[PDB]
Ligand binder design. Sequence first.
Ligand code: NI
Ligand code: NI
Length: 212
Amino acid sequence: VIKPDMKIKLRMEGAVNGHPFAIEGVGLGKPFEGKQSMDLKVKEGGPLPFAYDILTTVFNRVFAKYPENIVDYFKQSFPEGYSWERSMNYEDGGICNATNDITLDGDCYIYEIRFDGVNFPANGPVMQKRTVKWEPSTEKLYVRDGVLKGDVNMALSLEGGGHYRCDFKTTYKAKKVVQLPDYHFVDHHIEIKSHDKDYSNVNLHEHAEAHS
Ligand code: NI
Ligand code: NI
């Protein structure tokens, strides 16, 4: 059911500091190589008044290269698919909640995404768009109450130098019973490869690899 080459379509609806927006996307990847990319377009609420970077990790752990010796919760959950929930706690009190419900239609994954950011300070790097990129990261994955958790210490590099820290807590939920993994890691590296001036168009890449 998992094919070597796969597509993606998605819609995100969200709000940051009570201002709504909508984004759509199409993309493609290689699930077994842990690579994907996508083009994203802002449909409503542009030009976004906040750092696009806060959204990019929300725009699928099926696109992660799992070796044979680690159970792959995500590829097993297909064709029924899985959903996830995430809280993203920024060091200045900015908090983002996100969810993604992932279904499969033919060779295409479909994402229905909600994003909700509150309490970003007007003079902070998100609302003044002073972020450069996310550093590559290592997510720690562990089972709890029959579902899979993933935690990660993330950092955004900042235009004047330095970093801005965010802690991610994700819960991933297969829509059917699957085998559960042991403790393991996923290395991630997410990059905006191109974009237009106000980020109404963005081309986003990620490569991920599981290890134990
Ligand atoms: Ni890389
Ligand atoms: Ni740029």
